[PDB]
Amino acid sequence: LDGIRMPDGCYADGTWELSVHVTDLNRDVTLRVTGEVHIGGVMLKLVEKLDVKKDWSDHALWWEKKRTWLLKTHWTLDKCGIQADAKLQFTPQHKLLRLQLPNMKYVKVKVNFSDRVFKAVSDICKTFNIRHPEELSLLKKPRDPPGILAVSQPVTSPEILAKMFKPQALLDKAKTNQGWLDSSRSLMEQDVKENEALLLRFKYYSFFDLNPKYDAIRINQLYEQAKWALLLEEIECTEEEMMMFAALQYHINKLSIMTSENHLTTDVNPECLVSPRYLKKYKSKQITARILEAHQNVAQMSLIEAKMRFIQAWQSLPEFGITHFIARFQGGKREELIGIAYNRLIRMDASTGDAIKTWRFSNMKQWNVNWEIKMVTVEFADEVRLSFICTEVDCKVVHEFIGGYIFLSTRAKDESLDEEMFYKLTSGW
């Protein structure tokens, strides 16, 4: 203000203009600010200019160019590097997010797009009553070249199942794994539109205490992810196993009718199931209703166990639980895959999926990521070091996958996850 000359862009009073976009109004708002105004000063200056009866408590400042939220209210504009050339956004922190559940049904949820998606996913799963959210995460739908949460319906028609079948090669499936969101960053920083659908999927194939007594919805969604991966051939199996999976699905769907028809849609109760003193003490219509009421939990339990058997057969497949990533091994002559499992890394052929070399996590002493050239290096106690190179996106995802599976192995039946250990094992930045 009192320099050798006026600061460039400063009015007669030494203030300078700052454009802020309010997303709920599609309108830009200018505020005369100084380099010493704090972040909370910009928000309050906004709320004065905007509607004074509306609730602005969920709004925060978002800087698209710097891909960062401004949630430190005690920060000054100079401390944030915010000059007059900065385009900021005043936007709600909680937004609506379309999600395709593993059962292929679309829901919409409200989540803070400023929370690290690990914490997000944790809060989404608590809304869905799905235990162990660390086993799930969010996946961007790939580009083509409680009601719903308990719904488990079959394919409507062979034409419906046909429109979804994409006969993709193994390389294309590994390219889909580029869209696993960074757990250490938020939705906003990762190019997620509010009216765009993400995939909520089980990311790691190590399911801790999958309990049929209180994980019904967790079991249904896992089963539905298993069913659709088998139908659409995300994972392959023999012709015998396909008939068994089909018989199991046919069985599961016949049990589903029982768990939906036991009430009212029931005339099969014959009352020859209790002692004569019960027929003599209670009217026949009274004991039918009490048997029917207890049969809901009985029939529901047979349904979960059948889905449990479908899962267990799926887990017994030889390629089960492997997530593939394009990678160039240090001695290779072509593109190959690095396969990440709960207990091992697998060097795999990029065309067939045949495992070439397996490395156990138990022998893995440590690992590191050279971010400059995108090289991952693993040191072992029983053989020489393994080293490979991925793309820039894959390098972060492979790092989170490896650290995630080491974290999940630390889980013991005794227990608040310890997200600090997760963030340490799954972060590079």
Partner: peptide, 11 residues
């Protein structure tokens, strides 16, 4: 510019 982490579960 690297990120070296050690797995606690070497056994």
């Amino acid at each position: 510019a690297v990120t070296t982490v050690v797995n606690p579960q070497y056994e």
